[PDB]
Design an enzyme around this catalytic site. Structure first.
Site, PDB file in Angstrom:
ATOM      1  N   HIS A   1       0.799  -1.217   0.000  1.00 18.26           N
ATOM      2  CA  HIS A   1       0.000   0.000   0.000  1.00 18.26           C
ATOM      3  C   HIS A   1       0.835   1.272   0.000  1.00 18.26           C
ATOM      4  O   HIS A   1       0.624   2.163  -0.828  1.00 18.26           O
ATOM      5  CB  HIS A   1      -0.896   0.020   1.223  1.00 18.26           C
ATOM      6  CG  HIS A   1      -2.103  -0.843   1.106  1.00 18.26           C
ATOM      7  ND1 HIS A   1      -2.034  -2.208   0.924  1.00 18.26           N
ATOM      8  CD2 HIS A   1      -3.421  -0.534   1.130  1.00 18.26           C
ATOM      9  CE1 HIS A   1      -3.254  -2.711   0.854  1.00 18.26           C
ATOM     10  NE2 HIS A   1      -4.116  -1.715   0.974  1.00 18.26           N
TER      11      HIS A   1
ATOM     12  N   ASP B   1      -7.165  20.877   0.570  1.00 19.59           N
ATOM     13  CA  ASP B   1      -8.273  20.889  -0.359  1.00 19.59           C
ATOM     14  C   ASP B   1      -8.784  19.487  -0.684  1.00 19.59           C
ATOM     15  O   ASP B   1      -9.951  19.314  -1.065  1.00 19.59           O
ATOM     16  CB  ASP B   1      -7.841  21.626  -1.630  1.00 19.59           C
ATOM     17  CG  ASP B   1      -7.087  22.919  -1.330  1.00 19.59           C
ATOM     18  OD1 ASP B   1      -7.689  23.916  -0.854  1.00 19.59           O
ATOM     19  OD2 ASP B   1      -5.874  22.961  -1.630  1.00 19.59           O
TER      20      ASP B   1
HETATM   21  O1  LIG Z   1      12.259  -7.673  -0.101  1.00 19.38           O
HETATM   22  C1  LIG Z   1      11.387  -6.956  -0.618  1.00 19.38           C
HETATM   23  C2  LIG Z   1       9.977  -7.163  -0.523  1.00 19.38           C
HETATM   24  C3  LIG Z   1       9.132  -6.310  -1.115  1.00 19.38           C
HETATM   25  N1  LIG Z   1       9.570  -5.227  -1.840  1.00 19.38           N
HETATM   26  C4  LIG Z   1       8.596  -4.331  -2.483  1.00 19.38           C
HETATM   27  O2  LIG Z   1       7.465  -4.253  -1.640  1.00 19.38           O
HETATM   28  C5  LIG Z   1       6.243  -4.314  -2.428  1.00 19.38           C
HETATM   29  C6  LIG Z   1       5.445  -5.542  -2.055  1.00 19.38           C
HETATM   30  O3  LIG Z   1       4.044  -5.263  -2.224  1.00 19.38           O
HETATM   31  P1  LIG Z   1       3.155  -6.123  -3.179  1.00 19.38           P
HETATM   32  O4  LIG Z   1       2.005  -5.288  -3.640  1.00 19.38           O
HETATM   33  O5  LIG Z   1       4.009  -6.766  -4.262  1.00 19.38           O
HETATM   34  O6  LIG Z   1       2.636  -7.320  -2.262  1.00 19.38           O
HETATM   35  P2  LIG Z   1       2.105  -7.192  -0.776  1.00 19.38           P
HETATM   36  O7  LIG Z   1       3.398  -7.078   0.033  1.00 19.38           O
HETATM   37  O8  LIG Z   1       1.077  -6.046  -0.623  1.00 19.38           O
HETATM   38  O9  LIG Z   1       1.478  -8.584  -0.496  1.00 19.38           O
HETATM   39  C7  LIG Z   1       6.671  -4.253  -3.894  1.00 19.38           C
HETATM   40  O10 LIG Z   1       6.587  -2.913  -4.384  1.00 19.38           O
HETATM   41  C8  LIG Z   1       8.089  -4.834  -3.847  1.00 19.38           C
HETATM   42  O11 LIG Z   1       8.872  -4.358  -4.938  1.00 19.38           O
HETATM   43  C9  LIG Z   1      10.927  -4.955  -1.978  1.00 19.38           C
HETATM   44  O12 LIG Z   1      11.365  -3.997  -2.609  1.00 19.38           O
HETATM   45  N2  LIG Z   1      11.758  -5.850  -1.351  1.00 19.38           N
END
Ligand SMILES: O=c1ccn([C@@H]2O[C@H](COP(=O)(O)OP(=O)(O)O)[C@@H](O)[C@H]2O)c(=O)[nH]1
Length: 410
Positions: free
Chosen positions: A14, A112
């Site tokens: 998020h 806003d």
């Molecule tokens: O070791 C890690 C784990 C996650 N991410 C980043 O964290 C986000 C993970 O969110 P995603 O929507 O893929 O899955 P969620 O974690 O919400 O299940 C992405 O932007 C990944 O590139 C990262 O940079 N390194």
């Protein structure tokens, strides 16, 4: 042009695109106040380093105490996913400390528009309403995933946040319009009362999501030179998932049995080893918390064994890598139906969150994914093509981001 109060959901899937969207509306001239709890204030350091202190403000309120959250943990990526009902109940008590702050400001300086997480909209809309400010909600998932969820009869405990997003001024989602036009139009038509949807994606980074547990300079020196392009397999199930000892052993057997090179991302969990037992390899590396976009964008990496979370699909699509899907929770199955089934741009190589791969079956599929000609990669890359024209400049999302920033002024 608009002063925007940005309130992200303290979860990586998020907050990471919610801040790229913050930068994007920042670049077109907006002023931004970010509501953040204390420990999370530091994720703002990167973005704060790019903008003038008059254009970038930081409001920091203490994290509301909840018996069920360990001390010092203010971000769901460090908790069991079931803690979300507690993160919700705790974060909602930011409501009158936020009302207190806004009510002591010279009314001219009030924002806003509020750009808060759709997950927090039950109380963010009440604040926005008290000060007669438009509340635009944000989601890191696509319209298809939204369409299924909002359509269910029995939704709660997500019911209040879904009812609140419909009653919001509008919704901003991290997706591009030409992936899912049927589902944007349906969600736009009868799941937003005032029918205002903004597809603004894929949002691209500006050391993201967290400071990596191994220097990103060093992982590139491993990747270049890796002898062979499109030969390394990235393994990362995102922020939220933590595999069992049992599955981690079976997955580790597949990565050893396929003699492919790979980087394998492994997370932690907080309450109140398991990745045993080798590097009998120097064809690998392990974690931590990893630099995903640098790996996926790298030329030497051509496969991605992923949870198929919606953020990670877009990063792997922008990186131009084959997506091997193993959905486990949240929207991951929505996104398997969209990406593996309807569009046929990824292969499902795992079944359930508690699925345990066949270490031999999975080892053949890993070695084959290091192949340029695969048809699911060419279908995926034809989506990469639609997504790049959408993001910049004159595409669906450059225009949505222009239209969003303009609209916030009314
Ligand atoms: O070791 C890690 C784990 C996650 N991410 C980043 O964290 C986000 C993970 O969110 P995603 O929507 O893929 O899955 P969620 O974690 O919400 O299940 C992405 O932007 C990944 O590139 C990262 O940079 N390194």
């Amino acid at each position: 042009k608009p002063h925007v109060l940005v309130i992200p959901f303290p979860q990586s899937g998020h907050m990471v695109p919610h801040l790229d969207l913050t930068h994007q509306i920042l670049l077109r001239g907006a002023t931004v106040t970010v509501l953040v709890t204390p420990k999370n204030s530091s994720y703002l350091d990167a973005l704060r380093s790019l903008h003038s202190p008059e254009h970038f403000k930081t409001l920091i309120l203490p994290f509301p105490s909840h018996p069920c959250i360990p001390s010092g943990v203010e971000s769901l990526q460090q908790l069991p996913l079931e803690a979300i009902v507690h993160m919700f109940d705790a974060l909602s008590r930011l409501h009158d400390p936020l009302v207190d702050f806004l009510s002591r400001q010279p009314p001219s300086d009030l924002p806003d528009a509020i750009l808060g997480s759709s997950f927090l909209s039950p109380w963010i809309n009440k604040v926005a309403d008290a000060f007669s400010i438009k509340s635009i909600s944000f989601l890191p998932i696509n319209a298809h995933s939204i369409s299924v969820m909002w359509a269910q009869e029995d939704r709660s405990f997500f019911n209040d946040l879904e009812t609140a997003t419909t009653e919001s001024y509008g919704l901003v989602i991290n997706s591009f319009y030409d992936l899912e036009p049927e589902f944007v139009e349906t969600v736009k038509t009868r799941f937003l009362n005032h029918h205002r949807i903004w597809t603004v994606g894929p949002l691209l980074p500006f050391d993201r999501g967290g400071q990596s547990s191994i220097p990103p300079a060093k992982v590139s020196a491993w990747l270049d030179s890796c002898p062979e392009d499109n030969s390394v397999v990235y393994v990362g199930f995102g922020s939220q998932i933590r595999l069992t000892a049992e599955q981690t052993a079976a997955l580790a057997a597949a990565l050893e049995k396929s003699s492919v090179r790979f980087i394998w991302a492994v997370r932690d969990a907080a309450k109140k080893a398991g990745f045993e037992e080798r590097v009998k390899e120097k064809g690998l590396v392990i974690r931590g918390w990893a630099p995903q976009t640098m790996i996926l964008e790298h030329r030497a990496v051509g496969s991605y064994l992923t949870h198929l979370g919606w953020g990670s699909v877009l990063e792997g699509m922008v990186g131009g890598v084959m997506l091997l899907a193993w959905p486990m929770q949240a929207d991951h199955f929505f996104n398997t139906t969209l990406i593996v089934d309807k569009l046929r741009a990824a292969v499902r190589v795992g079944e359930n969150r508690d699925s345990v791969p066949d270490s031999d079956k999975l080892a053949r599929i890993l070695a084959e994914s290091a192949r340029e000609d695969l048809p699911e990669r060419v279908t995926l890359m034809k989506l990469r093509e639609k997504a790049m024209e959408a993001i910049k400049e004159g595409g669906s999302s450059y225009k949505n981001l222009d239209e969003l920033v303009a609209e916030m002024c009314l």
